[PDB]
Each structure stands twice: as structure tokens, then as C-alpha cells.
Swiss-Prot record, chain A:
Modified residues (N6-acetyllysine): 48
GO molecular function: protein tag activity; ubiquitin protein ligase binding
PROSITE patterns: UBIQUITIN_1, UBIQUITIN_2
Alphabetical list of Gene3D superfamilies matching this protein: Phosphatidylinositol 3-kinase Catalytic Subunit, Chain A, domain 1
Keywords per UniProt: Acetylation, Isopeptide bond, Nucleus, Ubl conjugation pathway
UniProt source species: Homo sapiens
Subunit structure: Interacts with AHR; interaction is direct. Interacts with NUB1; interaction is direct. Interacts with ESR1.
Lineage: Eukaryota, Metazoa, Chordata, Craniata, Vertebrata
Region annotation (Interaction with UBE1C) ranges: 70-72
Positions of post-translational (Microbial infection) Deamidated glutamine modification: 40
Full protein name: Ubiquitin-like protein NEDD8
UniProt similarity note: Belongs to the ubiquitin family.
PANTHER family according to UniProt: UBIQUITIN (PTHR10666)
UniProt PTM: Cleavage of precursor form by UCHL3 or SENP8 is necessary for function. (Microbial infection) Deamidated at Gln-40 by bacterial cyclomodulin Cif produced by enteropathogenic E.coli, Y.pseudotuberculosis or B.pseudomallei, leading to impair NEDD8 ability to activate cullin-RING-based E3 ubiquitin-protein ligase complexes (CRL complexes). Deamidation occurs on NEDD8-modified cullins. NEDD8 deamidation prevents switching from the inactive to active state by maintaining the 'closed' structure of the CRL complexes. Deamidation may also impair its deconjugation by the COP9 signalosome; However this result needs additional evidences.
From Swiss-Prot, chain B:
Domain MPN: 32-169
Cofactor: a divalent metal cation
Entry-linked Pfam families: CSN5_C, JAB
Task performed by this protein: Probable protease subunit of the COP9 signalosome complex (CSN), a complex involved in various cellular and developmental processes. The CSN complex is an essential regulator of the ubiquitin (Ubl) conjugation pathway by mediating the deneddylation of the cullin subunits of the SCF-type E3 ligase complexes, leading to decrease the Ubl ligase activity of SCF-type complexes such as SCF, CSA or DDB2. The complex is also involved in phosphorylation of p53/TP53, c-jun/JUN, IkappaBalpha/NFKBIA, ITPK1 and IRF8, possibly via its association with CK2 and PKD kinases.
Taxon lineage: Eukaryota, Metazoa, Chordata, Craniata, Vertebrata
This protein's name: COP9 signalosome complex subunit 5
Native source species: Homo sapiens
Membership in a protein family: Belongs to the peptidase M67A family. CSN5 subfamily.
Note: The CSN complex is associated with some 'Lys-63'-specific deubiquitination. Such activity is however not mediated by the core CSN complex but by the BRCC3/BRCC36 component of the BRISC complex.
Motif extent (JAMM motif): 115-128
EC number: 3.4.-.-
Curated annotation (Swiss-Prot), chain C:
GTP-binding found in the keyword field: no
Protein name: COP9 signalosome complex subunit 6
Main location group: nucleus
Organism of this sequence: Homo sapiens
Quaternary context: Component of the CSN complex, composed of COPS1/GPS1, COPS2, COPS3, COPS4, COPS5, COPS6, COPS7 (COPS7A or COPS7B), COPS8 and COPS9 isoform 1. In the complex, it probably interacts directly with COPS2, COPS4, COPS5, COPS7 (COPS7A or COPS7B) and COPS9 isoform 1. Interacts with the translation initiation factor EIF3S6. Interacts weakly with RBX1. Directly interacts with COP1 and 14-3-3 protein sigma/SFN. Interacts with ERCC6.
Domain MPN: 13-146
GO CC aspect terms: COP9 signalosome; cytoplasm; cytosol; nucleoplasm; nucleus; perinuclear region of cytoplasm
Amino acid sequence: MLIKVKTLTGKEIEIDIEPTDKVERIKERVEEKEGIPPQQQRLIYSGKQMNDEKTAADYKILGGSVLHLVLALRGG
Amino acid sequence: SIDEIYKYDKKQQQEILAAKPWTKDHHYFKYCKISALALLKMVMHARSGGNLEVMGLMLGKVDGETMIIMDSFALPVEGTETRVNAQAAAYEYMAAYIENAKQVGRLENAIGWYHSHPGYGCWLSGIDVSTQMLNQQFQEPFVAVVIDPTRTISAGKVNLGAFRTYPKGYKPPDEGPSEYQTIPLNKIEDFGVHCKQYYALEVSYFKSSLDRKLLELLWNKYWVNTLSSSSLLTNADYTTGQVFDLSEKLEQSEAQLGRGSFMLGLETHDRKSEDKLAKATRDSCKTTIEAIHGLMSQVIKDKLFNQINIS
Amino acid sequence: SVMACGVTGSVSVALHPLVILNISDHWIRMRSQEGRPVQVIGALIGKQEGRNIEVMNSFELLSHTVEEKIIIDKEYYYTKEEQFKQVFKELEFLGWYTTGGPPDPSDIHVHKQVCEIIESPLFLKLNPMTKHTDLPVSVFESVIDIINGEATMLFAELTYTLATEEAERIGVDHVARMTATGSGENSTVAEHLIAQHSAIKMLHSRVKLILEYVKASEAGEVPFNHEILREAYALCHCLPVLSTDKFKTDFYDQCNDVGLMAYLGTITKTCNTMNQFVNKFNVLYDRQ
């Protein structure tokens, strides 16, 4: 599947994914394209912040699916 | 009873937590009983914010359709009418408190959160409903509570509603009305959409020997200042604001009824702009009731004091 | 008891009821679970403004019994002292409370340990075994008094008062009444007016004590006086509270606004039933 992801430059990038793949890998694909370290990235899939060690099939992401990238969030 | 209520049962919560009835219905609850402690602590903490919002936590349990609020404690957290799930910052302080609490002998689990809306009424906002809706999944049981600490001094009646909201894409029933304490000019809209999403629960109490009485006796002297609320000037800004907005709604009503909702073999279903006059009449009542309530604070003085003259 | 039984000290303390309901509730819980009634010892917080003390709030502390003595755990207290001070720093530490009947040595042992936190802590003692109708909390301070030439820590008792907090009082009303809604929802007029009602009823009771005093000083049973009569005389004379030409129009101006406001609302309500009547009629008697 090829998922689209909305970046912080105001554009959208399609990237290669397998459903079994852990979601921290997608962060690295996004680094490769957008030059943003996977260390500071947070993936939001439809309103919620995506996990790290959890997989993409755990989020039921399909090839039409769209991801939102935002920087780290802390409550205080 | 009077003493059966005071003891907490760990097992009754373990059964309830397994059973998980709330997944079926979120309008399930209907009564509240809140401790004398819970209430006084909640008002004082709310009042310490000033006219600035504060959040605290409540410890309790549930038994059937009753919620029981045993104790409450304050949190030093900022994000009531901005940050969605402000409570997170508070978590470390809560984990401390529950641990400290268990060892002295208070074992009761967290029942919910309390916050306050000062000088605009007892209702949940956009921030508040959004934070509650996460809590009803994750935190359970979790209930929202609102109190106003300025409005209350004038009326003499505690406005405290404990509520719970419905999850997304859930059709509300016909459960509309509640207590009328005016909102400012831009906050009017926000109430209008959100109200049917939640319900308030009715409250009971109990009492014994250190906090209540300094207040009860003090009121015996104190009573003069509550009758010199004199609202009409203090919150003058409210009338002009609501009345200019109520005019915008009547323009909406003239068009809505005038042209009609475009429909082809379809008839309106529940909406927060469905039958505009029927909505609108109630908005006139929340503004009128407050205004005459202002007149009644004036009327009392005029008859009680001024008619005595010098005989 | 064990008490000096001296002249009343240099501070006053003020006493008032919900917190002991918090203590009682715990006592009931603990008693059901363990199988024996268990006391709790705790801190007081409140304020002091001058030499007079308003005990505003309290919290329960942890304790243990080794021998016949009670030891309160310090580490516990210091952890709870840092969390509570963040939210309430206006309030400060007054002292402690305990549970039991008359004063005993095991209270004086624990009061010396509290002297380490603040050098002058208050002691408070509640009997829930009271056969008496008056308020069964009694307040003490500790005095260091010499008996047979040896200095002994002995308690001295304080009298009390009632004080502020309207914000808190309105909740004590609700707490006190424990009334249920009738056929409706309870009316807007009803809910609004209760304070106003009770306020009149306070003035009824205030007039009554002054009036019977003035008569008593004339009649006999209280002697004649100048200081109190000159003041009561003066109290009558002030009425009515304004009559000036300046007040009258501004008083009516606000009354007149709230007279239009009310008129424009009763029409809006009527418009609604008119729109509803006209809708239902056209469908039935005509074809719309």
C-alpha cells in the first residue's frame, strides 16, 4: 500500500508501506523524504497520535489513508 | 443508609468495572450524592482561581445508577478553556495523592473531574466536552462537574451540575431544559450546540462537626451584603451583549421560516437549529430571568428599608 | 485529665461543622473493615490574622503505636506538605487534632513532636462518645508551667467564635437543607429568592434583640445606660436610606430598562405559540 502523509511544509507525500510494518518505520521514511529526524516526529492518524512499537495493521491503515505529522505534544 | 454510605466496598467496584454497563448507554446515570466535603472544597478551590478557571479531581464510587462523591482534591494545572486533556499535566500529582490517600485509609477510586466556569454559568464548553469524551472511554468511571463561585453568592443556591456527555455520532433525545444563568456575547453559540449532548444529575448530602457552622452563624450577620448584589450595573455588559446577538437569531428565523428548509421527501430531524422560534423563545427566557432577578434584588431593599422612614 | 487549668491564653480559635463529618465517615469505614473502631490523628490548616485563629481546613495523618505512645510519621507529612502548599499557600499550619475523651499523657507526648514543625502548635480534641448536646470539640494550646518547681507541658483551654466565607456558606445551605424537587423542576423564582427570604428573617431576629434591650434598660432588669442607647437612637434616625432628587431618577432609569426588557421577552414567547398555532391550523382546516 502507498499512504499519503501531510507534512509541515504544506504538502502531501506518498510512501511505501506494508501492513505488518511497525509504525516507527514510517517515521524513518518521512525523514528520508522530508529531512525531519524520526526522534522528533509524531504521527497522527485521524485525530489520534500514532503509537511507536504498535503496527500499521493495528491502526487499520489502507492505501488511501492519510497521515498528519506534527511535532511533540506535552500537557502542562 | 446514613452509615452504609460512608463505608466504601472494593469488591462492589471490581464487579462494576468488569461488568462495564456504560458501553450499552451513556445516559445511564441519574442521581448524584456528593459529600459535604466534596462540595466545600470544590467551591473554595474554584473561588481561589478568582474569575480565572481551575480544575480539580474527585474521588468516589458508583452504586447502580447513583454516583457517590466521597472526597475531592485540587490540582495546580492550567488548561480548562484552552487545552484539550489538561488533566495529563495533573497525572503525576494525582498518582502521588491516591498513594498518600490509600495508606491513611481512603481507598476510593477516581470518579471524575471538576472544573469551574466563573461568571458565565454552569455548562460544558468545547474544550470541556472534548476532554470528557476521551475520559469516558479511557478513565472510567469519569463524570464532568461545573460550579460558578460568583453567581452563587447572589442567588444563595448552589449551582452544581454533574454531567455526562454522549460519544460521537449519538442521537440526543428530547432532553432540553436546565438552570438559566446568562452567557456572554460570543459564548452563546457554543452553549447552543453542546447542551443536548449532556445531562445534569440531581444532588443529595449529609453533615456533622468542624467546617459548616463558621459559615452558618456568619451568615446571621453577613446577610446584608448578598442583597446589595445589585447586578444591573455589575454585569451590565451581559444585557447589551445577549440582546444584540438575540437580534441576529431573529434575522435567521425570518429567513428560515420564510424560505423554508429545502427538502424533497425528507423531513427535519434533531438539530440545534431545527425550529428556530422554539429555540429562540428559551434564549429570551435565560436573558429575561436574569434581568428581573436583577429587579428583585432592588425591589427588596426599597420595600424593607426605605418604607420605614422616621415615624 | 491532666491540665494546668489556667487563665485563657493569648490566642482565640474559631469552631464550625463539616470536617468532623469527614473524620466520622473514615471512622465508620475503618470500623466496618477491621472489626474495631480506629482513631485518626491529623493536621489543621487555616489562618491566623493577628493573635486570632480561624481554623479553615484539615487533613488526616498517618500514625503508629509502639508501646502505649503514638508516633506520627515524618516522611509522610513532609511529602504531603510539599503537594498541599502548591495549591494552598495562603493557608498555613496551625497544629493538630486527635480523638478520645478527656486529656491524657499520650496527647502531650505527640504535641512535643508537633512543636518541631512550628514552635507553637494548637491541640484540638473531639469525643464521639459524648453524652452531651453542646458541641463536643474542645480546643487547647500548651503552656509550659512549673509544678513543684519542675517544668511540665500542661494544656490550657480556649473559648471560640464563628467567622467569614459566604462562598462556602451557600454550599452549607444546600448541605443542610437536603430537599428534593417537587412536581416540576423547582421554580426560578423559588430558587433565586431563598437568600432574600432568609435575609428578611435575619432582620426580624436582629430588630428583636435590640428592641427588647432598649425596653429593658427603661423598665428594669437591665440598668440605665448612655453608650448603647445613644447608638440605638442614632441607628433609627438614619432611615430612610436616601430620599434625594438625584437618586430617584437613576433608581427609576434602571427599573424602566428591566420593564422594557421583560416586555420584549413576553412578546417573543407569544410569537412562538402564534407561529405554532398557525402551523397546525393551516394543515387541518385548509390545505396550507
